[PDB]
Structures are given as C-alpha cells and as structure tokens.
Amino acid sequence: YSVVKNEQVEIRAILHNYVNEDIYVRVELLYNPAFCSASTKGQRYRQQFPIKALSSRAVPFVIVPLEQGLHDVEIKASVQEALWSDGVRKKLKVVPEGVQKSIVTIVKLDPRAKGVGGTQLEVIKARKLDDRVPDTEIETKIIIQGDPKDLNLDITIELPDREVPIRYRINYENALLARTVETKLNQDITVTASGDGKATMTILTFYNAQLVCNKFHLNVSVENIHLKGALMLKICTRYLGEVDSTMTIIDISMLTGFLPDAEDLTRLSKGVDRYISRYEVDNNMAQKVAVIIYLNKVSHSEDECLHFKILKHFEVGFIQPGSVKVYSYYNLDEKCTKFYHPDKGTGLLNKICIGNVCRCAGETCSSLNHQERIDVPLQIEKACETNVDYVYKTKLLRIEEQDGNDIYVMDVLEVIKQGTDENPRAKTHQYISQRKCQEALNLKVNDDYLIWGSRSDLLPTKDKISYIITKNTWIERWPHEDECQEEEFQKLCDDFAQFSYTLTEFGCPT
C-alpha cells in the first residue's frame, strides 16, 4: 500500500507462463527518476532467462523511492520468438514516514444560551501538535449541523486562510444538513453563531506523528569460495520476546542471475523443524529465485543461524542486491528485512543524500572521460543527445566537503548546448559525488572542463543549483589557453574550439 521517501525496499514481481513449451523470456524494469532503481536513464535493467510450463518465476526488483506522492513502476516482458508479451504500469505510494492520527474537538452553538446579542463568538486556537512530522499533510474537516421545534441560525466561518469568510444559514429546511468545509492547514478557526436555534460543530483533524525492525536480530552475510562462479549465504536471527518465537518464516531473494545450491538447500530441508516448498532442480541449482523457508521456532536466546551455497548462471549486467526477511506467524507485520550484496556492506544500493533530499548514484563509479584526439562530428553526436539537457564549458573553483559527498564547485563559462537553466553562467553550480569516485573523476582546482549531463541528475538545493555526477554526466579536461602552445595539447585546443563553435552556434545535425 505504501512505502516511504528514501526507504530501501524490494518489490517482488511474479512472472507466469501458463503454457507448455518452456520459454526463454526477457524482463526489463523501467527507468523512472523518482527511483534509485537497478536501472539508469540510458540502460534499462533487464534479465533474460527461462521458465518451465504452467510455470512461474519470481523476479525481484530493488528500489528506493525518492520523490514522494504516487509514482509509476513499469515492468515489461517478452517471450523469445512468439506472440507472448506483457507490460504493467502500477502506480506506487510513497509517503513521508510517521503515522496517521486524528484529533476531534466539538463545540456547541447556542446563541440563546451562550452568545452576547444572540451573537456567539467561538474561536478555536490551532490545536497544539508537534509529535508531528514537518511539512506533512494536515487535514481538518469542519462540520456543522443544526439541532432539531423552531431554530434559526446565521453562522460565520473565518480563517487566516482567506479574507472572504464563509457564511451558512440554517433553519428548519436544512437543520439536518451537512455543513462541511475543510482546510489543509491547522490555524485559528473563527465561528460566529448569531441566531437562536441550537447546532453541533465538530472540528475533525488529521496529521502524522511518530516514534524500523524490532522483534528479530538479523545479520546476513555473503562471500566467495571458488568452483560458473560462486558465493556463500549466511543468515542469522533471534526473536527477542520472553520466549522462543513460534512458527517463523525466512524470506529470500537471489541476487540477479543467482540460484540456491540444490545440495545445501536439501541439507536444510531435512527437519521436523525446517520446511521448503517443493522446487525444481537442474544442474544442481534450485529454480526458486525467491526461496521461502518455514521453520518451527526461533530462540530469544541464542542467535539461531543457517547457511547455504549460491551459484551463478550469467554474469549479466548490474547484480541487484538481495533481500532477506524474517517474520513470525503471530507477527506478520514484521518489517524486519535486510539486504545483501557481495561488495556492498549494507547491501543498500548507492545513493546521495543531503537533508531530506535524496538522489541516485549509478552504484558503478564514474571515470573522467579521457581522450586526446576528438572526433568533432561524433562528439557532437554524443553531446547532441535526447537525454542531455545542457553542455557547458566551465572552470572548477573550490572543491568542498559535505557528508562524504564532495561538492566540486563549478563556475560556468561558455554555454554550448543551452540548458534548462535560464542562465547558468549566472549562479554558480554544485557538482556533487561520493568520496568513492574521488580518484576516478580526478578533478583539480582551477582547471576548465567540458561538462554535460542530464537534468535528471539535478538535486534541489537551497538557492544553488546542484547536480550529481553519474555514469551519465560526462566531464573532460578543457586544456587551458596557455597549455595551448604545448604538444600534449595543441590538438585538443583545436578539436574543442571547433566542436564548441559548431554546437554553440548551430543546432543538432538531425
């Protein structure tokens, strides 16, 4: 139903082939910018693989939502040499963490009993809060209806909201009527009931408050020993109530292109205490991509632990992190889930974070594209690309430190491909990337650079425009004018000057 801004979560797609003829099939995830997902604005995360008959295959997709509200997730999949194909866009709810809470207040309106000159001034101070979450939703429905006799109530409703206040009339014609008016900001309310009859006002308010992963301790580790390629999976867990956890469930996703070792899996299956659904075996591999493991109990005492071998088929593409999920029968809202990846400690896929604001990362580092002789037609093909919002030339002022994120501060010089920024050279630019990429980018102070990335990688900052350097934002050394005379360089001096003049002063070929 919901996930939250900047959580790492696995969504689990199932693929069904209700046919015969075993099939080879291809499953692409899509790229959507509101997500740090396996996929990138250029290369979609795809897997090709096979599935039996009447048969079914779990495909995990790991993702961190970033922007919140509703956002589309799209999976598509096609069967090799055949009609069969299918896609799915399902919208997904990203919310700010914190829980829903309702505070109701109820005033009586009785101008005859309470008001001054038949005129009753009722005000409701904005109800105090702040077990709240900042800049979160707040929904107050205000709700009057007259009490039944001969009543007649003129009624006023005023908020800072606007100046032109609302006014309702109530009499015997509509005493029993819904007099609702809502506002999405709690603030002092000003009802003025001037009349005679009686009436009920209910101010109903809603907002999010708060105080992940209890119930179970859970380590998960993984790493090699050599045989197509191989590695070891180790899962550790422990209830912590006062007594052994009854009937628990261990949930596992396989890293992309990975399968559980038939042998080992069988070695666990033997038990009056551990059970695994029947599962196909081929070349000593089990055909679950998602293996669930039902056990009879789990100590609150000692770390109960188990392990199995996991093997590879094709080294294909990125290797998507894997999920492990503990949950007790008596507690099926157990959100105790954790990730693993051979070379990722936490297993949480790369992202960059400042404040609330989060953005992608490519996971794979980004090298500063080096090249001596530049093909001007080609280069202009590259830089003249659907997914390239802008091409600047630009001198790198400061290099600064912020939360393991380097901010290479840039000032913009020439504007080749005009960005979306109405005026780049105006306000300085902040090009941010993780420490990990320090040496492979290898920037230096006071050098010039042809940089060109995509708008996709912007990062809403406080009155300073910043991008994040990606396996998609391209930077290059623009040899300085002096350096010009040199041998290592005259050539680049030229190629550039000409590519520059060319792009900056004429569109894109096609």
Partner: peptide, 23 residues
C-alpha cells in the same frame, strides 16, 4: 538480443480498478 518483441510494440497494462461500470 533480437530474440524478442520490440518495447515500442509492447503496451503495458495500466488500468486496474476494483469496481467500474457503474451504470
């Protein structure tokens, strides 16, 4: 590659109410 169907031609399923055709 080339063993499948063209994304441009695959049209995702996108509409899933729970109750419709209120007539």
């Amino acid at each position: 590659e080339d063993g499948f169907i063209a994304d441009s031609d695959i049209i995702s399923r996108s509409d899933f109410p729970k109750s419709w055709l209120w007539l």
